[PDB]
Amino acid sequence: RKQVSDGVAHIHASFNNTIVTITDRQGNALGWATAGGSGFRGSRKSTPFAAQVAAERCADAVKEYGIKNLEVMVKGPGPGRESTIRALNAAGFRITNITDVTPIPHNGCRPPKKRRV
RNA sequence: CUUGAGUCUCGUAGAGGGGGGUAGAAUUCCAGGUGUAGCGGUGAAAUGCGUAGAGAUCUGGAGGAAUACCGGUGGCGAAGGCGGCCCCCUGGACGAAGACUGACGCUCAGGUGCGAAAGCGUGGGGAGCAAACAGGAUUAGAUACCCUGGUAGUCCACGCCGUAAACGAUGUCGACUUGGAGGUUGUGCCCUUGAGGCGUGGCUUCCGGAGCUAACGCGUUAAGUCGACCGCCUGGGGAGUACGGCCGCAAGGUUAAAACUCAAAUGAAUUGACGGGGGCCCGCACAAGCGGUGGAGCAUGUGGUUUAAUUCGAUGCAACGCGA
Questions:
Q1: Which positions 50-69 on chain A have a beta carbon less than 7 angstroms from any atom of strand B?
Q2: Number of domains within chain A
Q3: Which residues belong to the signal peptide in this entry?
């Protein structure tokens, strides 16, 4: 119960998972979302209707603070960059600044050699 | 005596390196902080890792790799190859002026020197992350393509090992032979008015005349015309195999056959076919509804069995209320 009332949201999307962690502007998290525990398990996720309902998970733990406006920074590859925005727009929150803050690798190390097909 | 070769002065393009620190644009271990209910992964699922507090975010932080931009058909080097900048000190390529050198020129069987990765022993190191190794997953089954952890050893360095599609599958050197569109570097002349023209060198790019070739394809970067010089070639498999020699302490390199067998092997290209290669179209072919077979009984034919015989043929779409 701190009532920061505003904080950015980091949306880490992968090829098979998406998690929405709402932090403040300084770096203090209030509530994070998840896709592995949205009822079903295995690999049925990574699809829009399962990613938006996963993003809706912060509508039960972040509302207790009093966030009426927030920002969103998406990051990581995978389908669902629009499903999470639709989920945030349908949850009752606002939209302040949409950025892609994905970690850009600059080839510091060597990439793996698992794919040979 | 210069026009071949070599040489001076001034510069210009350009990952030429050797030794040395510097130290990033991002990075895994080892901590502090906000703080919950899961991180990851493949088309399905899971091993492992989270309440011993992970993945998400801020602070700085042990050490090895190494360029995302530049970065590219860029550009260099005899080749194998070289990416954070500098200087220590060496290389190659090119030009305008001037010279003298008088041929000092090209190539080479012997032979030395350069040699991708890995391994050996000597002295170290342990991240990112690696053949083997231990699990999950699939399939009729998996010593693998999939998902996760990893020993000496890949790194600096001392010598062995010297191989490959070290392939422009196109030796080296020099002289002449129709042509068109580009890339990186310079300046001469032309009001340089300028990004710009006319030249003039350079080598790497794309297409093509004659000509040559079996065609594909070469064609001022030659495989067209020549001259000098070196290597190699003689049907496949056997076979880069066996023996002996040279070298390597051993893991191998080189020189390098024979017996036997095969009546072929091969290159190019014209046809069709095929492909879980692509593209473009057609059909109640699908897409949406109606009526059904398959559910009950009966008729009929067929597949099996019995029968002294249940006649024969038809037998996947092209067979079964068919010959009837």
A1: 57, 61
A2: 1
A3: none
